[PDB]
A paper describes a structure:
Because we found that 19 C-terminal residues of this construct, including those of the α7-helix, were not defined by cryo-EM density, we prepared another deletion mutant, CPΔC79, excluding these residues. The VLPΔC79:h filaments had a similar structure to VLPΔC60:h, but a better-defined C-terminal part. The disrupted RNA-binding cleft in CPΔC60/CPΔC79 thus lost the ability to bind RNA, and consequently the RNA-binding loop S125-G130 adopted the conformation found in the RNA-free filaments VLPh and in VLPr. On the other hand, the fold of the N-IDR in CPΔC60/CPΔC79 resembled that found in RNA-encapsidating filaments, consistent with the CP-CP distances along the VLPΔC79:h filament being closer to VLPh+RNA than to VLPh. Thus, disruption of the RNA-binding cleft by large truncation of the C-terminal part of CP prevents RNA binding and also leads to the formation of monomorphic VLPs. VLPΔC79:h filaments are compact flexible hollow nanotubes with an inner channel diameter of 5.4 nm, with thermal stability higher than that of wild type VLPs and comparable to that of PVY virions.
Residue numbers in the entry:
A (entry chain Aa), B (entry chain Ab), D (entry chain Ai): 42 to 186
C (entry chain Ah): 42 to 63
Write the structure that this text describes.
Amino acid sequence: HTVPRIKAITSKMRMPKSKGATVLNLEHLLEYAPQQIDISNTRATQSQFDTWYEAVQLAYDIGETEMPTVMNGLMVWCIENGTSPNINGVWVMMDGDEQVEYPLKPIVENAKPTLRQIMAHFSDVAEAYIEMRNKKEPYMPRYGL
Amino acid sequence: HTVPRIKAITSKMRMPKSKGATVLNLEHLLEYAPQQIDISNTRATQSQFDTWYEAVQLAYDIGETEMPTVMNGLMVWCIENGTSPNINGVWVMMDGDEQVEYPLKPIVENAKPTLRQIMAHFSDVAEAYIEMRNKKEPYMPRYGL
Amino acid sequence: HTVPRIKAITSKMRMPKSKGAT
Amino acid sequence: HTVPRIKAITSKMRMPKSKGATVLNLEHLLEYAPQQIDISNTRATQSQFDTWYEAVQLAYDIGETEMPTVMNGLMVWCIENGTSPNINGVWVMMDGDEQVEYPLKPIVENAKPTLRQIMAHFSDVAEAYIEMRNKKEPYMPRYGL
């Protein structure tokens, strides 16, 4: 007659218990679907990224309107070079053919808990940039961010 | 009818965000294509090369017109011998068959952050010189710059 | 457009002060 | 039938004895549960804290209603700087941008048995203050209280 479709929460399944009650809240557990990247520890939490991005802008004294153009070069620089640079060093982003130097102290010192996890936010755009140039000319990099 | 060509910046791709806004400036990110050697940390930045080249010319007291001929010998000397020489030593470049001695103190002391990265500028011409002689006589070297 | 070149004397840097003046 | 549950006070366990009787009072020993911080010697006893707090308020001649606002600055000052300051010195707490100086003689002289143990009372709020600011801006300190 009717085909028995099995349920996801079987009756004979041990929900965790504490003093009789259940520690879980299995009516909204099914209505709880976060993205695999927004609850992963491989990326720094948005609060810690809002601090690194704000503690770097103050060290450079760059205005909020001129701030984002700097972050284009920072990712591109972090593509050839790894996310473990010299804290007593500088990174370069060009105004055409002229090199512009930026200190690496606020970048590494203010990145918590690790510069790798702070730079992991740029991972989505890093692939979108490497592949975009590979169409024109080879851009086989040395490290990643 | 029309074939759907995919875009590089997909709609469902996580641009990094800070307080709602976007840290990147993805309208000039695509119009930003620097050379892989001018934003790499394996070579000293042009400002630091403009300092080493100017702090060495003063120690030798060599005029700006006689200065570049010295740099021919320095690279050739740095081909057989590595970029980590004795600071209390000399390097040689010939006026034909007669040896001419130059101190190695301004070369190593004034090279920041490392003599290897300062000498990495000569990498393009180093290959163009080794291969040019290999046509005439073997020039299998011992180190590089 | 234009690359922001940082200055040596940042605005948020504590110049020594004496009775208001520097 | 019935599962034998073991007792905490086993019959074959040597209660300390003195002249036949028992030195312990093992009927209220089980009904005696103090906090691990209120019987620990790492913090000065409340009687000695009631003396230091009262012997400092008299030296500053500060009223009891204006007294507690001073203790906010004292802990914050004791976060960057350790609990072993110069007795012939002063500590600072701001009325906005204007420094206010307070002598360090009543703070150190009247703290028994050690200023570290007297300042150990503020340990619970010290973490609650460092973490609260770390959300806004980095507050990586140098010592603790």
